[PDB]
Short mmCIF file of C-alpha atoms in Angstrom, two decimals:
data_model
loop_
_atom_site.label_atom_id
_atom_site.label_comp_id
_atom_site.label_asym_id
_atom_site.label_seq_id
_atom_site.Cartn_x
_atom_site.Cartn_y
_atom_site.Cartn_z
CA UNK A 344 -17.96 3.57 6.64
CA UNK A 345 -19.05 0.32 6.78
CA UNK A 346 -15.90 -2.06 7.01
CA UNK A 347 -16.16 -5.68 7.09
CA UNK A 348 -13.95 -7.69 10.65
CA UNK A 349 -13.04 -11.37 9.86
CA UNK A 350 -11.89 -13.24 12.37
CA UNK A 351 -9.33 -15.67 12.25
CA UNK A 352 -7.83 -18.12 14.82
CA UNK A 353 -6.86 -22.28 15.58
CA UNK A 354 -4.92 -21.72 12.29
CA UNK A 355 -1.58 -22.08 11.02
CA UNK A 356 -1.00 -19.19 9.07
CA UNK A 357 1.83 -19.23 6.10
CA UNK A 358 1.15 -15.67 4.27
CA UNK A 359 3.55 -16.65 1.28
CA UNK A 360 0.06 -17.68 0.50
CA UNK A 361 -0.93 -13.71 0.60
CA UNK A 362 1.20 -12.92 -2.64
CA UNK A 363 0.00 -15.55 -4.79
CA UNK A 364 -3.57 -13.64 -4.07
CA UNK A 365 -2.72 -10.49 -5.82
CA UNK A 366 -0.12 -8.37 -6.59
CA UNK A 367 -0.30 -5.41 -4.05
CA UNK A 368 0.40 -1.80 -4.40
CA UNK A 369 1.57 -1.25 -0.17
CA UNK A 370 2.23 -4.37 1.90
CA UNK A 371 3.49 -1.57 4.86
CA UNK A 372 3.62 -3.53 8.01
CA UNK A 373 3.57 -1.82 11.95
CA UNK A 374 6.11 -3.19 15.15
CA UNK A 375 6.46 -6.26 13.15
CA UNK A 376 8.63 -6.96 9.34
CA UNK A 377 6.80 -8.33 6.45
CA UNK A 378 9.69 -10.79 5.99
CA UNK A 379 8.80 -12.63 9.41
CA UNK A 380 5.35 -12.44 9.74
CA UNK A 381 5.15 -17.21 9.41
CA UNK A 382 6.41 -16.99 13.14
CA UNK A 383 4.97 -14.58 15.08
CA UNK A 384 1.28 -14.33 13.85
CA UNK A 385 -0.31 -14.64 17.27
CA UNK A 386 -3.65 -13.26 20.01
CA UNK A 387 -6.58 -12.18 17.83
CA UNK A 388 -5.80 -11.79 14.13
CA UNK A 389 -8.50 -9.19 12.35
CA UNK A 390 -8.53 -8.40 9.02
CA UNK A 391 -10.10 -5.37 8.42
CA UNK A 392 -11.63 -5.28 4.79
CA UNK B 393 18.82 -6.69 -15.67
CA UNK B 394 15.71 -5.43 -17.13
CA UNK B 395 13.54 -6.25 -14.78
CA UNK B 396 9.30 -5.75 -15.13
CA UNK B 397 7.10 -2.67 -13.49
CA UNK B 398 5.41 -4.18 -10.53
CA UNK B 399 8.73 -5.58 -8.91
CA UNK B 400 10.84 -2.00 -9.44
CA UNK B 401 10.15 -1.19 -5.81
CA UNK B 402 11.04 -5.38 -4.72
CA UNK B 403 14.54 -3.74 -5.66
CA UNK B 404 15.25 -2.48 -2.38
CA UNK B 405 17.98 -3.54 0.00
CA UNK B 406 14.50 -4.96 2.71
CA UNK B 407 12.03 -6.20 0.97
CA UNK B 408 9.87 -9.16 -0.05
CA UNK B 409 8.23 -10.65 -3.20
CA UNK B 410 9.68 -12.89 -5.52
CA UNK B 411 12.94 -10.89 -7.02
CA UNK B 412 13.28 -9.16 -3.38
CA UNK B 413 13.23 -12.91 -2.25
CA UNK B 414 14.51 -15.33 -5.29
CA UNK B 415 16.01 -13.19 -8.31
CA UNK B 416 18.19 -10.44 -7.38
CA UNK B 417 19.33 -9.86 -3.16
CA UNK B 418 20.51 -6.18 -2.00
CA UNK B 419 22.87 -6.25 1.65
CA UNK B 420 20.28 -4.44 3.92
CA UNK B 421 23.58 -2.16 5.76
CA UNK B 422 24.38 -1.08 1.42
CA UNK B 423 25.17 2.05 -0.29
CA UNK B 424 25.00 2.47 -3.35
CA UNK B 425 22.05 3.19 -5.58
CA UNK B 426 19.36 1.47 -8.59
CA UNK B 427 19.13 3.47 -11.36
CA UNK B 428 15.94 3.57 -13.34
CA UNK B 429 15.53 3.39 -16.72
CA UNK B 430 11.89 2.57 -18.85
CA UNK B 431 13.45 0.37 -21.60
CA UNK B 432 9.39 -0.17 -23.02
CA UNK B 433 10.50 1.02 -26.75
CA UNK B 434 13.75 -1.25 -26.88
CA UNK B 435 13.24 -5.00 -24.55
CA UNK B 436 8.94 -5.22 -25.53
CA UNK B 437 8.11 -6.80 -28.92
CA UNK B 438 4.48 -7.69 -30.72
CA UNK B 439 4.86 -11.18 -30.12
CA UNK B 440 6.43 -11.45 -26.61
CA UNK B 441 10.16 -10.72 -25.66
#
């Protein structure tokens, strides 16, 4: 009801690290495929937790 | 092959994870069936298999 928003910027991403933090129930992307996020992550990035 | 349950969902023609990415890879335009059976009663061991 009071979800958190973290702003991600001025970084180099690297999304393979996200497979180390936890096993996932779901990892569903819209407009981009899971396999290509290392590139194509751009503009405002926000993590809704 | 024998795979663990949390990676069975990684066997789709296109998907990510350590199995989909590094151990068994299917073509994305593949025709066929991936048929799964629970073998806990046969493959598991008390000391570990």
